[PDB]
């Protein structure tokens, strides 16, 4: 239902091993479709999804030229932050940027985002008003003033409310074969036991997309459900996703617990046990 | 499509 388009910018200083490196990656929903790397011999935007390939030369030229200017701009922003935080120029630092538009289920705009970070800590961000910034440090407040004077957010609001939404809708209809596939998950059950009055059991999920999934070990609705060891979804590298949930049950409660499987592709909730 | 807006810190 909700459809997103995000562009991920990564700029990292590497003193002694080369000029800073800018990584630009675009994502629609959870699927990557464009990639830019300054360290590629011919720096240019590479297709990473089937539907984006049909695009003509001018689509690539524009994005490539923008990424190339962004490469040079964020290199100075890295130098700028050194003066703001009073850091050593020989240090290796990373600037990251998340931006894009969230689309409503009716095809109308839901939310717009432009968050920024320095060395993992949030630096600045655009509020849901698409007109004001949220500066974290005292250093970002200096930047906020500059962007407030240069009407930067205004220029960003046109993209987020215009160019972002049009092309997001464009990307969805051309690649709906894959973007709206909603491949549902799988279930496999095992039990790895210590056998000292104890045992471990695991509820699994395989080949699902999107990565949104819920795994819960309610013990026949027992008040306690949090003894379990959950792991993050791990890519199979087959363009498919895998996740397993573990629980250590005292020996003598084989089928008392009730796994809880939930995925968007499967409309009805699935409660499947051994 | 990428934002052409230059943000200078």
């Amino acid at each position, epitope marked *: 239902g909700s459809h997103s388009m995000r562009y991920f910018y990564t700029a990292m200083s590497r003193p002694g091993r080369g000029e800073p490196r800018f990584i630009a990656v675009g994502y629609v929903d959870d699927t990557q479709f464009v990639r830019f790397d300054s360290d590629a011999a011919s720096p240019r935007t590479e297709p990473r999804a089937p539907w984006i390939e049909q695009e003509g030369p*001018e689509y690539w030229d524009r994005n490539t030229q923008i990424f190339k200017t962004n490469t*040079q701009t964020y290199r*100075e922003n890295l130098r700028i932050a050194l003066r703001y935080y009073n850091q050593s120029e020989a240090g290796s630092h990373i600037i990251q940027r998340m931006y894009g538009c969230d689309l409503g289920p009716d095809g109308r705009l839901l939310r717009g985002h432009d968050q920024s970070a320095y060395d993992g800590k949030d630096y600045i961000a655009l509020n849901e008003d698409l007109s004001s910034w949220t500066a974290a440090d005292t250093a970002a407040q200096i930047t906020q003033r500059k962007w407030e004077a*240069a009407r930067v957010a205004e220029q960003l609001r*046109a993209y987020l409310e215009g160019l972002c939404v049009e092309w997001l809708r464009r990307y969805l209809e051309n690649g709906k074969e894959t973007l709206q596939r909603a491949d549902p998950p799988k279930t496999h059950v095992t039990h790895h036991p210590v056998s000292d009055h104890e045992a471990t059991l695991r509820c699994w999920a395989l080949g699902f997309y999107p990565a949104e999934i819920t795994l819960t070990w309610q013990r026949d609705g027992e008040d306690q459900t949090q003894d379990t060891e959950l792991v993050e979804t791990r890519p199979a590298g087959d363009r498919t996703f895998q996740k397993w949930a573990a629980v250590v049950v005292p020996s003598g409660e084989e089928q008392r617990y009730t796994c809880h499987v939930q995925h968007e592709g499967l409309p009805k909730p699935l409660t499947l046990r051994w | 499509q990428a934002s052409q807006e230059v943000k*200078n810190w």
Partner: T-cell receptor
Amino acid sequence: KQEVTQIPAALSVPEGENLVLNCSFTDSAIYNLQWFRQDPGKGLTSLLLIQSSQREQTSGRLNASLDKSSGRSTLYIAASQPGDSATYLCAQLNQAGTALIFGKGTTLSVSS
Amino acid sequence: NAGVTQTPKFQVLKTGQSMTLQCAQDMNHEYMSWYRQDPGMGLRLIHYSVGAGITDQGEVPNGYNVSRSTTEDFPLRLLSAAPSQTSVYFCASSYGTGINYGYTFGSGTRLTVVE
């Protein structure tokens, strides 16, 4: 690669007669079209700004149009006055927004 | 007050001399540009600066050098003067690389290089 052509390159219009200045460009995903007037020694004076999304824009005696499909824009000037005589320039914004592609311009000769 | 101020307005150089063309704004414009007009060739881009410390070449950059140490000034140095560099030079500024706003130019500098 990005070429802007202003034909006709010159015009001679009687006083009080409405005239149209034409401009041609190549459609991009997003861009602006801007019209300027160069009077000798005065530099470029901004007149109107139209964008790819918009179709028309009016200010007083000046109307600007934009057709993304035909890659062309028109500048309509009403109640031609003798002081309106200058070189009028049309310009498009490059794809990355780093420059303004300028046409060679069109000279206006309003006859009193 | 506002606008782009270009200094000088007129100047005469001979071949091999050096001179800086000054362009200043206080309109908080992060983008600045340098153009030249020669008859029959239209306005041609020399150099642009999307921001301070950032600078790239344009259509005809040979023989021209620029600097953007500050956001308010974008000078143009003619390291060695040449007869081909006789032209009218225009400086333009704008808030940035977006489509929302437009360029503002200066009065112009008419430069004549003489043998």
